[PDB]
């Protein structure tokens, strides 16, 4: 009377036995709350949130828990008033009920608004009660009424448990306040999604993070663990175990998900067996159908809990890594600073942290993928037998083959990356010197130079396309690669074996499962190798030696005290300052004096605890303001540069700004002091950078100032003014202890104390007059001296219509072939079993041929698609480059250089890497979903009525997801860049920050910048889970209906038709979610194509008109004639009617604001003539093509910008002039001695802008360019080597006509026929003799 099959599996009324009802159905819920409870105290204790108040809901639940216990014990009372189960079961139920009410009580105490255990437990109890209820109502007072009361109370308790209790910024994330049901299905983001449909998302209306995802909590925890280990020993992975306890729930969730996923094919086997057998009740089939849907729903909920936990752990890992690296960068010693690069360190933060999030999502595969394949193997084995091994051998041949590919893809990126940077380093060199480049027609040469690098880069992309082809091939047809071999061996080995519907289709479903773990595991292994590579970098960085923090005694308010102190720049390097001793009293001006490399700047570095103190005692008293030699400028506005995170005082600020003589600099700058100075914003001259640095130090109002050569780049008058109003005894810092490093004698007599040193050693310090009287070292020193479809059509044109249509045809052929192969397997399964099947050889051969066609087609579209991607990228980059180069300088000056150089990099990276792969994934998923839907209706046509409900809801999520995700996927991208770009700045001014003691402010700044990025990132990773849960639920509904419609119509179809319909239904779930994701990725990445075709409407005079082309000797004499010239800019140039005769030296004089320089722009047609007819000799300029005239006229600009490469490519990019001409021109440019000195001869590799070369040399190289050009018309733009360049321009260019715009009248006096420009008009036209 406990368990039989007659009343439970062979009867049309599926009733449970009486004993089963009273034993197992009651042991399930009571025992469910018994194994988790002891484990629930762990969570309830470790995690606390206060206590919830006394509410009616909490009490209602507690009172019903008391009554429920009574009712269950009331049964024991009546039993006490024969059957053994009538004693233990009621008491056990009462006791577990007493545990339930105690649990809601303690959950109130521990502050859990919504409970998961107190919901699943009631759900399980309800289902058990429902089963007994149905049985008890089918049986029909004494003990039944107690059960009805129990069931009603349990139902009301379950309904109550759904509501969220009262709680223990104006925009907190609803993560914490959401109930259990909302947390399971991620419903709390729905509003944020739906708002994303009408109200465009902004960084302000974004949620704030939780307390578990903020830098202030995640970073100090990892820092403490890192400190504990170092002192304990310093290994690293040991520390990452801290994330383990949280990451541990991922283990349980993945373990549950694996079994839940494998419960699918078993139910499919049961269903196929049911359809095969005629003598079976319909309720049996309905049971399997409902069980499959329940299993799928539990699987998806568990999987998306696992994924969310895994993603949150990775985000925390990134946050902790960023925080730890930033906090360490402020403490590492000098040698460690130089051990890396301000560049590599930033790249370490940018790459290692991202790799950790990238790894986290699939690190669990190392233990899950093996189980997800091994368990399938055993299921396949018991289904088929030994023939499985012959299949798995192919699986063996798949892992290494797939791994080597993942090995190649790992390395090819490197060969691509170094090729990309080499391009992007060159493009800036083009963009910085665009005017000089387009002054004498270097557009083509540099275009070809860039295109060569582009081709070298595209070779690697072609190789990566060939690799990704095999990768996709394996991913797509690994299931069938296994299936064909396994079925062939199974049929061939033995004649007696019969392949029915259940074997073939359950094995096919199992292979569909095997597909994922097989092809993800090598990718996980490669990612682990990369992460372990990055771990070594993080180890060697975090383990760096921090500089002694107490080396310098910083006593709060004899001002500076040094006795017998020797300092080093490294532990093993020799001392730089040997045995220094000096006492600087309060409010005294001390000047450090020495030669180059003496040790002056080292003294100020040592007073800031930047040098490594090998011995001594330093007692700097009070706050220190450091003015470094190399000025550190924050990208913030000039006002905040001077303020330096300090309260603004209008009177003090306005006293500081002009005392540094920053008023003219404020005037020239556009926005004044609100202008964005720094590398990214407006560039500033060195002297201006010094003034701002000094102004910042003066505003900081310290007592001790360390001025490491503040007046190096300021002019003599500006320097004297600054010293008078700032550093001098009658300036701003009169009472401040100033210690200045100088090599200028002009202010030395005003200094109170002069510390003169030699070779890092104190050498007879003293006051100026006393030192002069002593006549020693100081005397010697003094004596020394919604995307539109048009974008998609444009991209498909860029690929090429033939390639695009061929790729589309090959997908259709691949997917039709796969569908036909599966249908053929379905026909094979249900064949006359005439003892076995006789079509075996024929059907096996046909199935093999279809699969070979499938594989050949798959490798086909990828190759076409992948090659089409390369073709489109090549054409897009070429078009962009041609449009930019042909564009006038007005674009360059109007559009920011940063925005333009963004597309030359990010857009090309997107088109080169992301777009083709996303198209492949999107179209593969779309065709798989369409094919599965097609098969569903082929097997069950009545499933068409299920389309409208799903097709509506699928329409909504698809409409709600992409409209919102594109915002977040953008909001994150624009927010992660300010993080690293901040760190770089912090890395440039570590010494300044430590001197001002502003570590904490920058720590908070970095924490805030990381938190903003996380705020942008977390909603996206929750939107992924939201979308996936919705679409997986849709897929589970479609599997439910597809199985149900086969069950109801099992007398018209075959288990094979069922086997195929349900098997494809199981595939629909994992493909709908990826289809919508890939639609989102397409709608986000295809905008890059629009950004690339933006400059399509490139606009300058067509080069080489070839219709009015001039003769070879166009400047026959060089007769220039400005005939009523007017230059628009309202008119800078106006009423210009001048004539410069051939071979007549002519200069242009004028003040700032005149049309002097603009006149040169007129000669080279930089700006089109608003009204003018400039004619050289007998030919109009406006008619001639640009290149022609730009080649026949030469210019020596203000600052010659030398381009990266060899000197010969600088002189002659086209290599048109012979080597003898280059040598002669270089000799004639007073450069033969220097140019012969480089070991590379003419191939000297000059860096960006010729940093290695001096300014004089670069000027002479530009003169050499002009001389090598050998043209009759030459223009000069004048600002030490002036004597040399002036003599050289006066030496052999007397034959040629030279215009000269000089800000100095001394040189212009030599040139006859001076033209003076007052405000664009010709004020005077005649020789300098007539001028005076
Ligand atoms: C892509 C292969 C090359 C191209 C092949 C051509 C066409 C293939 C057809 C369909 C494409 C996609 C199929 C399934 C997704 S499936 C998405 C993936 N897997 C799961 O959803 C986990 C479920 C799985 N069954 C398991 O074992 O847990 C995942 O981790 N999602 C995380 C998230 O939600 O963000 C995988 O591609 C994701 C892996 C992508 C990757 O890391 O390269």
Task: Give me the secondary-structure topology.
Layout: H1 18-46, H2 56-80, H3 85-109, H4 117-139, H5 144-162, H6 180-185, H7 190-198, H8 215-232, H9 237-240, H10 244-276, H11 282-329, H12 334-339, H13 342-363, H14 365-384, H15 387-432, H16 434-437, H17 443-493, H18 501-542, E1 560-568, E2 577-584, E3 589-593, H19 600-607, E4 612-618, E5 624-627, H20 638-643, H21 650-659, H22 663-668, H23 686-700, E6 704-708, H24 716-727, E7 737-741, E8 753-756, H25 768-774, H26 777-784, H27 789-799, H28 801-829, H29 840-886, H30 889-894, H31 897-939, H32 947-988, H33 990-996, H34 999-1048, H35 1055-1085, H36 1087-1092, E9 1120-1128, E10 1131-1140, E11 1146-1150, H37 1156-1163, E12 1169-1171, E13 1175-1176, E14 1179-1180, H38 1186-1192, E15 1193-1196, H39 1207-1211, H40 1219-1228, H41 1232-1235, H42 1255-1269, E16 1273-1277, H43 1282-1289, E17 1297-1301, H44 1305-1308, E18 1314-1317, E19 1322-1326, H45 1328-1331
Parallel strand pairs: 3-7, 3-8, 5-6, 6-7, 11-17, 11-18, 15-16, 16-17
Antiparallel strand pairs: 1-2, 1-4, 9-10, 9-12, 9-13, 13-14, 18-19
The structure holds the ligand CCCCC/C=C\C\C=C/C=C\C=C/[C@@H](SC[C@H](NC(=O)CC[C@H](N)C(=O)O)C(=O)NCC(=O)O)[C@@H](O)CCCC(=O)O.
Residues 303, 307, 372, 472, 475-476, 516, 920-921, 924-925, 1024, 1028, 1070, 1074 line the site of ligand LTX.
């Amino acid at each position: 009377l406990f368990w039989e099959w007659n009343v439970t599996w062979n009867t049309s009324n599926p009733d449970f036995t009486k004993c089963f009802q009273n034993t197992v159905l009651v042991w399930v819920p009571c025992s469910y709350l018994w194994v988790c409870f002891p484990f629930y105290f762990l969570y309830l204790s470790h995690h606390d949130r206060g206590y919830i108040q006394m509410t009616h809901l909490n009490k209602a639940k507690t009172a019903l828990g008391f009554l429920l216990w009574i009712v269950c014990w009331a049964d024991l009372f009546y039993s006490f008033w024969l059957a053994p189960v009538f004693l233990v079961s009621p008491t056990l139920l009462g006791i577990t009920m007493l545990l339930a009410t105690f649990l809601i009580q303690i959950e109130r105490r521990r502050g859990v608004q919504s409970s998961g255990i107190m919901l699943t437990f009631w759900l399980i109890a309800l289902l058990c009660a429902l089963a007994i209820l149905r049985s008890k109502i089918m049986t029909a007072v004494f003990r039944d009424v107690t059960f009805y009361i129990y069931f009603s109370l349990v139902l009301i308790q379950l309904v109550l448990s759904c509501f969220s209790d009262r709680s223990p910024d104006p925009n907190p994330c609803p993560e914490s306040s959401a109930s259990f049901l909302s947390r399971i299905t991620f419903w709390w983001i729905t509003g944020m999604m739906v708002q994303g449909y009408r109200q465009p998302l902004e960084s302000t209306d974004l949620w704030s993070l939780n307390k578990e995802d903020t830098s202030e909590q995640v970073v100090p925890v990892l820092v403490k663990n890192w400190k504990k280990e170092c002192a304990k020993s310093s290994l690293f992975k040991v520390l990452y175990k801290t994330f383990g306890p949280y990451f541990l729930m991922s283990f349980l969730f993945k373990a549950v998900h694996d079994l839940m996923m494998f419960a699918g094919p078993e139910i499919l086997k049961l269903l196929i067996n049911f359809v095969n057998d005629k003598k079976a009740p319909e309720w049996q089939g309905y049971f399997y159908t409902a069980l499959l849907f329940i299993s799928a729903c539990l699987q998806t909920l568990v999987l998306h809990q696992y994924f969310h936990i895994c993603f949150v752990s990775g985000m925390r890992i990134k946050t902790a890594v960023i925080g730890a690296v930033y906090r360490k960068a402020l403490v590492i010693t000098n040698a460690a600073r130089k051990s890396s690069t301000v560049g590599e360190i930033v790249n370490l933060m940018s790459v290692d942290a991202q790799r950790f999030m990238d790894l986290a999502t699939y690190i669990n595969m190392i233990w899950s993928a093996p189980l997800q394949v091994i368990l399938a193997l055993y299921l396949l084995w018991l289904n088929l037998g030994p023939s499985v091994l012959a299949g798995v051998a192919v699986m063996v041949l798949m892992v290494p083959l797939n791994a080597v590919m993942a090995m190649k893809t790992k390395t090819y990126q490197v060969a691509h990356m170094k090729s990309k940077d080499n391009r992007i380093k060159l493009m800036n060199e083009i963009l910085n010197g665009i005017k000089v480049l387009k002054l004498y027609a270097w557009e083509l040469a540099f275009k070809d130079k860039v295109l060569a690098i582009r081709q070298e880069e595209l070779k690697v992309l072609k190789k990566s396309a060939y690799l990704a082809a095999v990768g996709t091939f394996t991913w797509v047809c690994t299931p069938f690669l296994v299936a064909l071999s396994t079925f062939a061996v199974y049929v061939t080995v033995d004649e007696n074996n019969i392949l029915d519907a259940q074997k073939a289709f359950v094995s096919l479903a199992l292979f569909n499962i095997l597909r994922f773990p097989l092809n993800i595991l090598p990718m996980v292994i490669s990612s682990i190798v990369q992460a372990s590579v990055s771990l070594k970098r993080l180890r060697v960085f975090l383990s760096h030696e921090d500089l002694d923090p107490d080396s310098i005694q910083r006593r709060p308010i004899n001002s500076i005290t040094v006795k017998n102190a020797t300092f080093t720049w490294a532990r093993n390097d020799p001392p730089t300052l040997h045995g220094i001793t000096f006492s600087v009293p309060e409010g005294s001006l001390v000047a450090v004096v020495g030669q180059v490399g003496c040790g002056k700047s080292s003294l100020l570095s040592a007073l800031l605890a930047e040098m490594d103190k090998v011995e001594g005692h330093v007692t700097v008293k009070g706050s220190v303001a450091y003015v470094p030699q190399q000025a550190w400028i924050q990208n913030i506005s000039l006002r905040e540069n001077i303020l330096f995170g300090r309260q603004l005082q209008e009177r003090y600020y306005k006293a500081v700004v002009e005392a540094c003589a920053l008023l003219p600099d404020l005037e020239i700058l556009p926005s004044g002091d609100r202008t964005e100075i720094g590398e990214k914003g407006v560039n500033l001259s060195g002297g201006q950078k010094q003034r701002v640095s000094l102004a910042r130090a003066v505003y900081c109002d310290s007592d001790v100032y360390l001025l490491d050569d503040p007046l190096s780049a300021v002019d003599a008058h500006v320097g004297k003014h600054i010293f008078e109003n700032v550093i001098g005894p009658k300036g701003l810092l009169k009472n401040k202890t100033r210690l200045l490093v100088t090599h200028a004698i002009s202010y030395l007599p005003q200094m109170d104390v002069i510390i003169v040193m030699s070779g890092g050693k104190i050498s007879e310090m003293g006051s100026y007059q006393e030192l002069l009287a002593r006549d020693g070292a100081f005397a010697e020193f003094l004596r020394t001296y919604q995307v539109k479809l048009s974008v998609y059509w444009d991209y498909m044109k860029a690929i090429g219509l033939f390639i695009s249509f061929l790729s589309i045809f090959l997908f259709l052929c691949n997917h039709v072939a796969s569908l036909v192969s599966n249908y053929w397997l379905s026909l094979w399964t249900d064949d006359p079993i005439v003892n076995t099947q006789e079509h075996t050889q024929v059907r096996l051969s046909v199935y093999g041929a279809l699969g070979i066609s499938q594989g050949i087609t798959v490798f086909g579209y990828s190759m076409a698609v992948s090659i089409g991607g390369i073709f489109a990228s090549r054409r897009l980059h070429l078009d962009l480059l041609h449009n930019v180069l042909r564009s006038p300088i007005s674009f360059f000056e109007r559009t920011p250089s940063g925005n333009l150089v963004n597309r030359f990099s990010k857009e090309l990276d997107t088109v080169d890497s992301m777009i083709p792969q996303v198209i492949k994934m999107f179209m593969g998923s779309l065709f798989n979903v369409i094919g599965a839907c097609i098969i569903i209706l082929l097997a069950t046509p009545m499933a068409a009525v299920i389309i409208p409900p799903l097709g509506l809801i699928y329409f909504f999520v698809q409409r709600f997801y992409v409209a919102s995700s594109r915002q977040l996927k953008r909001l994150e991208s624009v927010s992660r860049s300010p993080v690293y770009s901040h760190f770089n700045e912090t890395l440039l001014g570590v010494s300044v920050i430590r001197a001002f003691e502003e570590q904490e402010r920058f720590i908070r700044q970095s924490d805030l910048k990381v938190d903003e990025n996380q705020k942008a990132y977390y909603p996206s990773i929750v939107a992924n889970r939201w979308l996936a849960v919705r679409l997986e639920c849709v897929g589970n509904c479609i599997v439910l209906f597809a199985s149900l419609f086969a069950v109801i119509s099992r007398h018209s179809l075959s288990a094979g038709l069922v086997g195929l319909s349900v098997s494809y239904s199981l595939q629909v779930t994992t493909y709908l979610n990826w289809l919508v994701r890939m639609s989102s990725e397409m709608e986000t990445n295809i905008v890059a194509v629009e950004r690339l075709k933006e400059y399509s409407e490139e606009k300058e005079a067509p080069w080489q008109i070839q219709d009015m082309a001039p003769p070879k000797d166009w400047p026959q004499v060089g007769r220039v004639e400005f005939r009523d010239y007017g230059l628009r800019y309202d008119l800078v140039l106006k009423h210009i009617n001048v004539t410069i005769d051939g071979g007549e030296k002519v200069g242009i004089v004028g003040r700032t604001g005149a049309g002097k320089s603009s006149l040169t722009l007129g000669l080279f047609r930089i700006k089109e003539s608003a009204e003018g007819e400039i004619i050289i000799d007998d030919i109009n300029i406006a008619k001639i093509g640009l290149h022609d005239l730009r080649f026949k006229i030469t210019i020596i600009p203000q600052d010659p910008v030398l381009f990266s490469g060899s000197l010969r490519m600088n002189l002659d990019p086209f290599s048109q002039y012979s080597d003898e001409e280059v040598w002669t021109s270089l000799e004639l440019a007073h450069l033969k001695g220097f140019v012969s000195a480089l070991p590379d001869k003419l191939n000297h590799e000059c860096a960006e802008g010729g940093e290695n070369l001096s300014v004089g040399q670069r000027q002479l190289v530009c003169l050499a360019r002009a001389l090598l050009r050998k043209t009759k018309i030459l223009v000069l733009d004048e600002a030490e080597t002036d004597d040399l360049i002036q003599s050289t321009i006066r030496t052999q260019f007397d034959d040629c006509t030279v215009l000269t715009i000089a800000h100095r009248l001394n040189t212009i006096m030599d040139y006859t026929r001076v033209i003076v420009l007052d405000k664009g008009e010709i004020q005077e036209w005649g020789s300098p003799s007539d001028l005076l």
